[PDB]
Symmetry: D2
Amino acid sequence: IKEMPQPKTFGELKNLPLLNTDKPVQALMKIADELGEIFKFEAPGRVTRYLSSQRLIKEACDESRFDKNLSQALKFVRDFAGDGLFTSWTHEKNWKKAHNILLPSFSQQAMKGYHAMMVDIAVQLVQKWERLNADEHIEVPEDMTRLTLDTIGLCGFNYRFNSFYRDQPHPFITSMVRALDEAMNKLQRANPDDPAYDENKRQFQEDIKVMNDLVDKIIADRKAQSDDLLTHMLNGKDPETGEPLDDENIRYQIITFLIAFHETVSGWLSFALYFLVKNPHVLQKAAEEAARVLVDPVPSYKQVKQLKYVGMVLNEAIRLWPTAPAFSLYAKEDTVLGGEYPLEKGDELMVLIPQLHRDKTIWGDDVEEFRPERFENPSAIPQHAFKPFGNGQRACIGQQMSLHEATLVLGMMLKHFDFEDHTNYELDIKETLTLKPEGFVVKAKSKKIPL
Amino acid sequence: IKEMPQPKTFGELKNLPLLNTDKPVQALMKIADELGEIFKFEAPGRVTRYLSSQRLIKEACDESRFDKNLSQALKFVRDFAGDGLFTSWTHEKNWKKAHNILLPSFSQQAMKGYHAMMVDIAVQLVQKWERLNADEHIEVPEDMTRLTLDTIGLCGFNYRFNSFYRDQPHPFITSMVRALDEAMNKLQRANPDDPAYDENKRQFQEDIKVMNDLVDKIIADRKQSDDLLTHMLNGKDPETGEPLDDENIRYQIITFLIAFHETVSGWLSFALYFLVKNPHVLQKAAEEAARVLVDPVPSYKQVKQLKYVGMVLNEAIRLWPTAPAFSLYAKEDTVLGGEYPLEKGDELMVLIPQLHRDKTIWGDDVEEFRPERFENPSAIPQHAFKPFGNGQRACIGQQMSLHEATLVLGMMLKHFDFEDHTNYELDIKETLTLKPEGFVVKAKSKKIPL
Amino acid sequence: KEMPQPKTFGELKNLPLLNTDKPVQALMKIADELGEIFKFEAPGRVTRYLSSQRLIKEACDESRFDKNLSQALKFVRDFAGDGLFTSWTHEKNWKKAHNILLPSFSQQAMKGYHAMMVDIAVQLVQKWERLNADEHIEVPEDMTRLTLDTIGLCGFNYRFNSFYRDQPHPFITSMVRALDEAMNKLQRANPDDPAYDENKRQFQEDIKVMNDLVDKIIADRKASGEQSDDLLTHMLNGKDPETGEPLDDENIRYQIITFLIAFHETVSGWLSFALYFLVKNPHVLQKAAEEAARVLVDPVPSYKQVKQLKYVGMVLNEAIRLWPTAPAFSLYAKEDTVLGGEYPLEKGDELMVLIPQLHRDKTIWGDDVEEFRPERFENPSAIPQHAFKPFGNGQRACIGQQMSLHEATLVLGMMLKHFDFEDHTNYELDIKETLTLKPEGFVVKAKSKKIPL
Amino acid sequence: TIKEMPQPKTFGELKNLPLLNTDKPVQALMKIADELGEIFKFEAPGRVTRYLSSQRLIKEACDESRFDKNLSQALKFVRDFAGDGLFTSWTHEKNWKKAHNILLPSFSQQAMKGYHAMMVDIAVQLVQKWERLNADEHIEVPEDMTRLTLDTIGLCGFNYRFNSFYRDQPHPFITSMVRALDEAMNKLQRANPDDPAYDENKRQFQEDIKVMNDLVDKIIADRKAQSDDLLTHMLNGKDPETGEPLDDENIRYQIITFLIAFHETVSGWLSFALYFLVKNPHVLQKAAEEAARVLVDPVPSYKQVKQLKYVGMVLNEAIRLWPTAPAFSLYAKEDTVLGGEYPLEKGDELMVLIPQLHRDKTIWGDDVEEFRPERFENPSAIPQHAFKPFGNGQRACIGQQMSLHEATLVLGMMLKHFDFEDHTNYELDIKETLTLKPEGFVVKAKSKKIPL
Ligand code: FDE
Ligand code: FDE
Ligand code: FDE
Ligand code: FDE
């Protein structure tokens, strides 16, 4: 009872050239604004539907009708993340297995344990920024990346990257960044066999070895003893099959966590810092809460949760630019979406989170303005209207940890510094598969409080 | 005595790679934002200084200290616009000659003369928008180009480009456009002799030929009309008694054609953008238009009384002045602002968009579209607002442009309600001028007839 | 029974294999590696490349196979339309134009074109006389000026005046660029990517350029009624015996484009190649120059005299054997059939004759296939049937074979009569490939023998 | 002064630099020489040089009392990872004459007898690889010559086993070297080396030097764990004026130097010979003839390698037509006049186009392009300085005897054991790094069924 909108198609190439930007997500957003809540996007070999209104999004988040689909994006990341929690299909050996082995390791009770090491990495950042000279500035995404990676490596696997002791990035991080870019780059390749991509292929494998070799370096330090993320993997057993996780799979989970945490949380903080320096009154409300609550030289686990405004900023940043901008679904059985669009079994849907988070119908007509005050009552927001961490059983396992980190770090930054948008930086959002601000720089004057 | 800041330089290429964007002006504004009111900009074989605070620009506008310089930009334009007014040196032969011959034709008294022909073109645009079907949209920069170009050919030269009767741009307009891109592109070539730049060198001569050709049919076909073109054929220099030679005239026509259509097309487009982005201001101007434009066709008198429409235009050109910069050189040794010593011949660049963002002058809300700043146009300090250049070398076409945009904007506001149906994000395309790219709207006609 | 096929790249088949600027030569190397036949697959199409006289002989059976419009020719049809070269044998305008024009390329017709042919030829000789001592000759560039001017004057009584220019006629640059675009579409897997927008639009403008002067020439003569006895009046006045009607204006415009392109592209390459092999084989140059001197006894050559340069004709034939400027033609099986007892073909299957490789079939030419020996052709009937097909086959064979040979023989004769040629650069053969073949950096210096015209 | 020197087409401030914007610079300089003759000026943005091609001028330029070895722009770029090694050092630099006198013993004819055995080891591995191929397959000639030449210099020279024949994608070191060498050539064409577009290139290059210094600098320690080899001569030899052995970092520069120069020159050299053999079947016959007659043991003897006279002649005739290191550079020690026609300021640069020298028609006769190895039957008939494939003077190629022995040995064994088919009718295509090798050259080989 409704023909679905579709953008300009270029011959046999369908809609693919339309996402021949350096900014595909943002290109999909611009399409969403022109065609409305749902549009078909077909490329050679695949077809999908992108949804942008909460009315259709809530139905797709009905777990009896739709199951998580591996988007072409995720299908290409699977070539180095394999059977990890992020890139495994729901119905498959290790998803449920790893899911129940690892879920205890991220429940609110796990956070109390990670808190000490999180603080460690957070002081290094504060000390680095403290120790900068006057004429210097801060490269925000890079230092957030230094932070996030160091924090997961210590909390999760008790491995010290020492990112703050390095100027050129780590070999691992560069391979991870190059691998993700390649996964993205395969989306626009109309035929991946063309010889033009031979060097691109050769490097892809060279970086997969670099990561896969290095992760086993993490494994060497232990069997050759501490309440940590890795221990649960080598040591937790399935209640039905009795076994632990395979050595090959434990690998993929590590790659997954390293990639997921360091990438998603880097954008998150950077965006929060971006929005703070652009909204100085919000900064004021957030900076004062920092001083009043963070009364110790270093924070305690209990003190973090009181930062009720710092948390609101983070959520409001994540509303506007969700660092994992999309998740994919398929129909378990034949169905009708919204009484208008019939779906055959196996058809793919794409939830375009940033555009869902821009539904005026839900948020009012100031969808675009950075106002953390929307979130004082998280309970007024309808169901499936704010889904930055996915949905259902395949929802983000790393939510409670990421939020702990972001709120922790942001608090200490606001407690210890004031930040000047000394360049009048125009937001430039880089798209690998995640989103991050690119070239964001600030200067920070230390408030002269000791640690 | 104050040492001047300079951004990052790359070996023998100096600051040249920093502008290896498709957006140099915008990249320079970014540099201005990091380095402050003035910075030195070095390229291979050249040096200039970019000024951004009203403190420095006011000095540089002393016609006793500084004269108009042909920036590297304009030096490349001189290859197809030659010694026309825009691309002339002040003291060269044809400038003051041509300037004093033509000023009468851009005086306020000529406007009453052009007004009919201007209305003619504007009715065409309005009828084009009325005749769209419901599902269709409007391509704003492209239709402003049809409008601005057709307007000057009819007012100036009684030539009908018929852009509204065409879907791919006119062959003249496209070569004229491609010539501008090459002038810009020559800015970025570290060595223009490289054979990679040979296909370009060939297209360039063909485009110069295309425009030079079209003009000469207009100019020769004349040898009964009181317009810019006969003023050129008949105007006489009071010292030598002769008109401009046919070559210089050709150069004036080319100059005007591009200069008007490029700046005025961008300008109207920016106004439409800022209006759809601030609907109260659209409301007030729409209300103001409806009350004043009370006849089926607007009159010359009524256009001076679209006082709010004019304020909008002033506020848009404040934000994005479609001709974004002018250049100056020091006539003799001096110090600029007590801090920066300058040798004779040293170059200055007025970065008009950054000047219009000097919080010191405009307040702390610079980035806001508020036409009410232009209630009292006398309230604004001198040398704070330079959209039309400066001095004797200031835009000779200010009235005509202002008259044009104001007439056109008003009729659109009287005749349509406009929908930003795509939530268009501003993307400003750079030739040498500025212009929004991909700006589209939907327009529902108010069914007022013409 | 299973046919060789070169290396395939995923869903892209063999197409990346000849993403060179020189496809024919890459195909010549596939044939060298894989032999008399190999399958060449592209997205959406399949063809078989044949190189042995054994298979070509069957492929020339007009009762079994007909002329196919190769993918290449399919793209040329975008501006050569319904011209003789790009017509299907069963299309309406083919047989029509064919029976109408054949007299205009006959031998009695050549006697008529000869003088205007001579006209362009003196223009070439004088330009070469009037050069100063230091300069060289840009050989392909001057052969192009000559061949184009000759077809325009002989065919259409139109003067391009190429010798009075440095920028080629505005038209020939389009005509050349259209050919390059036609060639360029061969390697584009996705023809729709927006990157080919400047290409596809420049293309449409170049077609506008060619049609303008061709429709001007065809209209300008439909007013002066002038009885030049040339291709153009023969097209305007000749009538089809079945419909009683002459060729439509749209179709004539296509034959002109066809003839301008066909003559200028094939013959200039041909002359260029002959001259290359001559300056590279000085003993052969001597014999031809001697025959040139002995026969060209008049201030300007006469038609009877041209018949008589038997050795330059053998040179020309030996040149077109090594590098046939039009390197391939295509056929399809009119019905299901088996080729050479090993390869069954369904009706409609496409075959491609790789003429350069055919002309190197050692079992036919002997063990010295690559040496330039014009003495192979002094007994022309000794050559087996379908062993030497530089002009195609059967009813679809080149209509301009005679006209071209006359031009080349005449022109080459005069060059040898009037100059001594020096390979002052030791030019290494570098063959540019558009749709036809021609050498690229070829230059020589020529000392005038001071014989007058 | 008498004679204004020719100069090819100039592109404004970019001079004639665009003339070598091929992937085949050397071949372009030949095409220019063929039209402008025995000498021409070649200008670049920051430099000017003169190319010599006639034996007449080259005989003068090889006067060691007037000219010395210059570092061409090319060799200046190799100096970034080969540093102070013999190939990239100035004569008056402190490590040249130092390293030169300690190493001459390791390449004297006397030294060869020792290298002979390990030379054979790698030589059989190659023969075994070819023997074990199935019939439908072919031989990728440059790749297998690169495998051999590198394994031989690495084994015979430093007792390190690369084991190239046990891998299909090339060694990381060799892939890094070739990419480092490619970067050196790639710079020659950049009139803007500061431009940001070259950041990934500058990055990768810096990573590639680390790769070489990694393995090589480990090898110097890995031996301190002493036999009689090139590395031992470097670790143990003493300079008589300061009495010191070579610098630890200088040795790293020599090893890198020797690995590259050998593997790049010798592999190219063998490949070219094989091309000429399969293209000249009668020469192939006579060459396999002597091979069959002399190579009478399951393994070659040192004496026997010397007793191949025609195989050596094919080698000489191969390097004549395509000398794998095609050029060397010189500077004027003082002001002087070249050929009585061209005056030179002190410090002016000369480039010898060895391929063009080796085509000087007045010297070799008019069949200069023909592959005729019998030109080398009487080597004393060849004029002094007409045939300089190994450079000139004290700066002459130190390894020419090692190289000739390897090429003679290997080429001999190939001719004994296989018959070769140009089964694809391969057209000669020259890959240019700084050195010259042929590309995509392939043959099929039918075994003569003979054991080792
Ligand atoms: C470590 C970590 C950290 C994190 C964080 C984050 C942030 C900030 C954001 C986010 C997100 C997300 N996630 Fe996240 N995260 C993580 C993780 C993860 C994992 C493992 C996963 C998978 C799970 C399942 O489902 O199985 C996720 C998950 C996730 C999601 C979903 C996806 C789909 O496709 O559905 C989302 C949307 N994550 N996230
Ligand atoms: C027609 C026309 C129109 C116009 C418009 C306009 C607009 C809208 C804006 C503008 C601007 C300008 N201008 Fe303009 N305009 C014109 C023009 C002109 C001229 C001619 C000139 C030059 C002047 C003199 O000096 O003479 C100008 C001018 C001008 C200027 C200045 C330049 C310099 O460098 O100095 C500026 C800034 N404009 N504009
Ligand atoms: C005008 C002219 C001239 C010429 C020349 C020549 C030369 C030198 C060479 C040649 C060739 C040829 N052709 Fe040549 N030609 C011509 C033409 C022609 C035509 C029209 C054709 C088609 C035919 C029919 O079909 O009808 C030809 C044709 C021809 C051929 C065939 C085609 C196919 O596809 O088969 C060939 C191979 N052609 N050719
Ligand atoms: C081991 C080795 C091996 C070799 C080989 C060879 C071959 C096959 C060829 C050759 C070559 C040469 N080298 Fe030689 N080689 C070597 C080496 C060398 C050295 C070390 C050098 C340097 C020495 C001097 O001079 O000091 C050379 C050296 C050489 C030379 C010279 C360089 C210049 O710059 O002068 C030449 C030309 N190589 N090579």
